[PDB]
Write an enzyme that holds these catalytic residues in place. Structure first.
Site, PDB file in Angstrom:
ATOM      1  N   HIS A 142      -8.157  -2.645 -12.038  1.00 42.03           N
ATOM      2  CA  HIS A 142      -8.153  -3.718 -11.046  1.00 42.03           C
ATOM      3  C   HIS A 142      -9.279  -4.736 -11.226  1.00 42.03           C
ATOM      4  O   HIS A 142      -9.225  -5.837 -10.648  1.00 42.03           O
ATOM      5  CB  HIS A 142      -8.186  -3.179  -9.616  1.00 42.03           C
ATOM      6  CG  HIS A 142      -6.935  -2.477  -9.202  1.00 42.03           C
ATOM      7  ND1 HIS A 142      -5.681  -2.989  -9.447  1.00 42.03           N
ATOM      8  CD2 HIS A 142      -6.746  -1.294  -8.565  1.00 42.03           C
ATOM      9  CE1 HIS A 142      -4.771  -2.154  -8.965  1.00 42.03           C
ATOM     10  NE2 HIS A 142      -5.392  -1.111  -8.444  1.00 42.03           N
ATOM     11  N   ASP A 179      -0.464   3.641 -13.995  1.00 42.61           N
ATOM     12  CA  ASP A 179      -1.003   3.808 -12.655  1.00 42.61           C
ATOM     13  C   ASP A 179       0.004   3.083 -11.757  1.00 42.61           C
ATOM     14  O   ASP A 179       0.632   2.094 -12.183  1.00 42.61           O
ATOM     15  CB  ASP A 179      -2.420   3.205 -12.594  1.00 42.61           C
ATOM     16  CG  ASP A 179      -3.043   3.265 -11.200  1.00 42.61           C
ATOM     17  OD1 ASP A 179      -2.484   2.603 -10.284  1.00 42.61           O
ATOM     18  OD2 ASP A 179      -4.097   3.943 -11.027  1.00 42.61           O
ATOM     19  N   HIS A 181      -0.306   1.240  -9.245  1.00 41.14           N
ATOM     20  CA  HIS A 181      -0.712  -0.096  -8.799  1.00 41.14           C
ATOM     21  C   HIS A 181      -0.789  -1.097  -9.940  1.00 41.14           C
ATOM     22  O   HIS A 181      -1.014  -0.732 -11.101  1.00 41.14           O
ATOM     23  CB  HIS A 181      -2.045  -0.022  -8.052  1.00 41.14           C
ATOM     24  CG  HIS A 181      -2.034   0.972  -6.939  1.00 41.14           C
ATOM     25  ND1 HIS A 181      -2.671   2.194  -7.024  1.00 41.14           N
ATOM     26  CD2 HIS A 181      -1.425   0.944  -5.732  1.00 41.14           C
ATOM     27  CE1 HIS A 181      -2.467   2.870  -5.907  1.00 41.14           C
ATOM     28  NE2 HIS A 181      -1.715   2.133  -5.105  1.00 41.14           N
ATOM     29  N   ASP A 267      -0.993   8.253  -9.584  1.00 39.21           N
ATOM     30  CA  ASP A 267      -0.651   7.912  -8.204  1.00 39.21           C
ATOM     31  C   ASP A 267       0.815   7.503  -7.961  1.00 39.21           C
ATOM     32  O   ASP A 267       1.190   7.209  -6.830  1.00 39.21           O
ATOM     33  CB  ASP A 267      -1.629   6.876  -7.600  1.00 39.21           C
ATOM     34  CG  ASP A 267      -2.053   5.792  -8.585  1.00 39.21           C
ATOM     35  OD1 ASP A 267      -1.539   5.700  -9.725  1.00 39.21           O
ATOM     36  OD2 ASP A 267      -2.931   5.009  -8.204  1.00 39.21           O
TER      37      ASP A 267
HETATM   38  O1  LIG Z   1      -4.849  -1.909  -0.533  1.00 45.23           O
HETATM   39  C1  LIG Z   1      -6.004  -1.499  -0.421  1.00 45.23           C
HETATM   40  C2  LIG Z   1      -6.355  -0.136  -1.083  1.00 45.23           C
HETATM   41  C3  LIG Z   1      -6.503  -0.294  -2.611  1.00 45.23           C
HETATM   42  C4  LIG Z   1      -5.768   0.750  -3.446  1.00 45.23           C
HETATM   43  C5  LIG Z   1      -6.651   1.071  -4.660  1.00 45.23           C
HETATM   44  C6  LIG Z   1      -5.853   1.418  -5.924  1.00 45.23           C
HETATM   45  C7  LIG Z   1      -6.897   1.746  -6.984  1.00 45.23           C
HETATM   46  C8  LIG Z   1      -6.436   2.613  -8.181  1.00 45.23           C
HETATM   47  O2  LIG Z   1      -5.466   3.362  -8.138  1.00 45.23           O
HETATM   48  C9  LIG Z   1      -7.337   2.584  -9.411  1.00 45.23           C
HETATM   49  F1  LIG Z   1      -8.289   3.431  -9.049  1.00 45.23           F
HETATM   50  F2  LIG Z   1      -7.890   1.413  -9.703  1.00 45.23           F
HETATM   51  F3  LIG Z   1      -6.822   3.113 -10.488  1.00 45.23           F
HETATM   52  N1  LIG Z   1      -6.985  -2.170   0.235  1.00 45.23           N
HETATM   53  C10 LIG Z   1      -6.829  -3.379   0.864  1.00 45.23           C
HETATM   54  C11 LIG Z   1      -6.061  -4.429   0.309  1.00 45.23           C
HETATM   55  C12 LIG Z   1      -5.910  -5.663   0.956  1.00 45.23           C
HETATM   56  C13 LIG Z   1      -6.538  -5.868   2.190  1.00 45.23           C
HETATM   57  C14 LIG Z   1      -7.309  -4.837   2.757  1.00 45.23           C
HETATM   58  C15 LIG Z   1      -7.457  -3.606   2.102  1.00 45.23           C
HETATM   59  K   LIG Z   2       0.259  -0.123 -13.320  1.00 49.86           K
HETATM   60 ZN   LIG Z   3      -3.780   3.274  -8.655  1.00 50.72          ZN
END
Ligand SMILES: O=C(CCCCCCC(=O)C(F)(F)F)Nc1ccccc1
Ligand SMILES: [K+]
Ligand SMILES: [Zn+2]
Ligand SMILES: [K+]
Length: 367
Positions: A142, A179, A181, A267
């Site tokens: 990310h 992944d 995401h 995930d």
């Molecule tokens: O959506 C999220 C959570 C983020 C999910 C993280 C995924 C990360 C991974 O799987 C990786 F670790 F990068 F591999 N937060 C958020 C997004 C928008 C507004 C407020 C909060």
């Molecule tokens: K991906």
């Molecule tokens: Zn992820």
């Protein structure tokens, strides 16, 4: 010979006292002992690698800290300094987005994580190792050129691809990200650059928001060398394998990279809280098998798996072990959840899953 990286400090990442964002008293978000992204999940994967006997068939590779020069092949100087800054803080802190915290001195772990991917990449490209799995933490995909994002401080697989490019003299590298995401960071870093092909399979609009459409295709000389495969929630083994055979493998074969790097997250698993996909350990096994076999055909087997996400401390270890068993060719354990998850579905390609994958097929022609 199959390389394996785990550093104790990968299990020491400080994720705070919140669930996702910080604990927050006004919002009445009670503190909790295990944040979604707590390091225990990935530590359990390592301990399972060990306790299963799988480690006896691996060649342990010590992580080396990514230098400033390594990091700058993928990130801006302002990003790196900001991370130094945040790491200097008494209890560290948030890196910019509100959900991505570095503990105090946390930069040391971020360098060992990126560095684990680099070291593993170096020893495979050298011919010492045929392939490997770097079980790194914090994750990477990310993080764009100029930011930390979504638990990611530096883009581990892009630091490795930048090293393969600049130091090893490779002309073409592919990064395949499964992944669940969107790999927005990796897309960002190599956007304008045809010498790194970036492929992301992901749940459509899961994370980040408003990101990972199939129309995001790169720009300039890099137009046609970013491939997004957004999939509907509920997609399982059938959808993922259809996507592999109909999009991923043909993209790789068309591209002819010298090295395949896999952003390997679990995930998309059936039991993950941070997405709604239905992949089982056998799904991940079958995906790993096809990609390894593809690498064997087109780039003398040079394939490096690098840990991304996954948030089931119960199930992730068995999804992860399945991929390592495909690397070593040595089977250690059955999936003790198999019979339980088997009846739940995902194993049939649904019409809307097919339509989603068929949208990407025309894009193959431009590679
Ligand atoms: O959506 C999220 C959570 C983020 C999910 C993280 C995924 C990360 C991974 O799987 C990786 F670790 F990068 F591999 N937060 C958020 C997004 C928008 C507004 C407020 C909060
Ligand atoms: K991906
Ligand atoms: Zn992820
Ligand atoms: K690219």
């Amino acid at each position: 010979a199959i390389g394996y990286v785990w550093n104790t400090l990968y299990g020491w990442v400080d994720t705070g006292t919140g669930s996702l964002a910080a604990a927050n008293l006004t919002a009445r978000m009670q503190p909790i002992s295990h944040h979604l992204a707590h390091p225990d999940t990935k530590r359990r994967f390592h301990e399972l690698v060990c306790a299963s006997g799988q480690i006896e068939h691996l060649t342990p590779i010590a992580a080396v800290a990514a230098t400033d020069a390594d990091i700058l092949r993928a990130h801006s100087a302002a990003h790196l300094e900001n991370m130094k800054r945040v790491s200097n803080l008494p209890t560290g802190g948030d890196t910019g987005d509100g959900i991505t915290m570095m503990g105090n001195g946390g930069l040391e772990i971020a360098r060992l994580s990126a560095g684990g991917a680099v070291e593993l990449t170096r020893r495979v490209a050298t011919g010492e190792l045929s392939a490997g799995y770097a079980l790194v933490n914090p994750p990477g995909h990310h993080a764009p050129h100029n930011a930390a994002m979504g638990f990611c401080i530096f883009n581990n697989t892009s630091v490795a691809a930048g090293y393969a490019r600049a130091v090893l003299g490779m002309e073409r590298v592919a990064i395949l990200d499964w992944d669940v995401h969107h790999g927005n960071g990796t897309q960002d870093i190599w956007w304008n650059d045809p010498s790194v092909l970036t492929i992301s399979l992901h749940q459509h609009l899961c994370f980040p928001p408003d990101s990972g459409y199939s129309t995001e295709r790169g720009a300039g000389n890099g137009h046609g060398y970013n491939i997004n495969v957004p999939l509907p929630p509920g997609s399982g083994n059938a959808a993922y394998l259809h996507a592999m055979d109909q999009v991923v493998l043909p993209a790789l074969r068309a591209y002819r990279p010298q090295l395949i790097i896999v952003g390997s997250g679990f995930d998309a698993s059936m039991l993950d809280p941070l997405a709604r996909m239905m992949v089982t350990a056998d799904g991940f096994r079958q995906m790993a098998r096809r990609t390894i076999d593809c690498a064997a055909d087109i780039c003398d087997g040079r394939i490096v798996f690098v840990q991304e996400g996954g948030y089931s401390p119960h199930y992730l270890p068995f999804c992860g072990l399945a991929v390592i068993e495909e690397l070593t060719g040595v089977r250690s354990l059955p999936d003790p959840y198999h019979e339980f998850l088997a009846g739940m579905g995902g194993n049939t390609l649904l019409d809307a899953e097919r339509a989603a994958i068929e949208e990407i097929v025309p894009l193959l022609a431009d590679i």
